[PDB]
C-alpha cells in the first residue's frame, strides 16, 4: 500500500532528525538583536558581495564558507565574510556545550531571513559542499520545515510532504542520515506567517570543489 511507503519513509527521516530546545527567550532575544546587525550592516553595503544574497522572500548571509542543479561551487577563501564574534560566543558555544558538534567543526555559519509568505523551493544540502550533521537555530517565530516535498510540484498526486517538523524559536535541529542525503525538504509558504530567521553551522567537505 501507498500508506505503507509512506509510513516507512517518515520512520527513516525521523532517523535522521533531532530536536531540542536549548535557548530560552532571553538568549533568542540577544541573537535577535545580533540578527538584526547583520541586516542593517549588510543594507550599509558593509559586507562583501557574496557575503549577501538578497532574493524576494528571503536575504541569505554567508559567513566562513559560501557557495553559487548540484553544481555549487565554494567560494575561493577569504571573498566571504568571517564567521562573527557573537556567533561563536552566543549559538556555537552552546552547541559545543551541550554536545550537539564538537569544537572546531563548524567552518560556515548562514542565516537566513524570511519575509511572511517565504518559502524554500524543495532541495537537498548539498552533499559535494557539506559533512554531516547540518545544524540549524531558529528565532524569530515557531515554523515548519516538511520533508518530501513533491507536492509542492504535484499536487494533485500528492497534497501533503512525507514529514512536517514543527521549528520552534529557540529550538535546534540537527539533519544526518536519510533526513539529510535520502530526501528533500522545504519550507511552505503558508508555514511562514511572520518574519522567521535561522543560523544554519555547517562544516565544508576538504574537496567541496571551488571556483
Given amino acids: ?29 540577544k541573537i535577535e ?12 553595503g558593509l559586507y562583501n558581495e557574496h557575503t549577501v544574497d538578497r532574493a524576494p522572500l528571503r536575504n541569505k548571509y554567508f559567513f566562513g564558507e559560501g557557495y553559487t542543479p548540484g ?7 577569504g571573498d566571504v565574510d568571517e564567521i562573527p564574534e557573537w556567533v561563536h560566543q552566543l549559538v556555537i558555544q552552546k552547541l559545543v556545550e551541550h554536545r550537539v558538534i564538537p569544537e572546531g567543526f563548524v567552518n560556515s555559519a548562514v542565516i537566513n531571513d524570511y519575509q511572511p509568505g517565504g518559502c524554500i523551493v524543495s532541495h537537498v544540502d548539498p552533499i559535494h559542499i557539506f559533512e554531516r550533521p547540518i545544524v ?10 516538511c520533508f518530501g516535498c513533491k507536492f509542492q510540484f504535484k499536487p494533485i498526486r500528492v497534497s501533503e510532504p512525507v514529514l512536517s517538523l514543527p521549528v520552534r524559536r529557540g529550538s535546534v535541529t540537527v539533519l544526518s542520515g536519510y533526513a539529510a542525503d535520502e530526501i528533500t525538504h522545504c519550507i511552505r509558504p503558508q508555514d511562514i506567517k511572520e518574519r522567521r530567521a535561522v543560523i544554519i553551522l555547517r562544516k565544508t567537505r576538504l574537496d567541496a570543489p571551488r571556483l
Fill in 71 to 77: 553544481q555549487e561551487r565554494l567560494y575561493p577563501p
Fill in 33 to 44: 538583536a545580533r540578527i538584526d546587525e547583520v541586516v542593517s550592516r549588510a543594507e550599509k
Fill in 136 to 145: 540549524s537555530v531558529s528565532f524569530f517565530s515557531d515554523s515548519a520545515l
Fill in 1 to 29: 500500500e501507498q500508506q505503507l511507503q509512506k509510513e516507512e519513509e517518515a520512520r527513516k527521516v525521523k532517523s535522521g532528525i533531532r530536536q531540542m530546545r536549548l535557548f530560552s527567550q532571553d538568549e533568542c532575544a
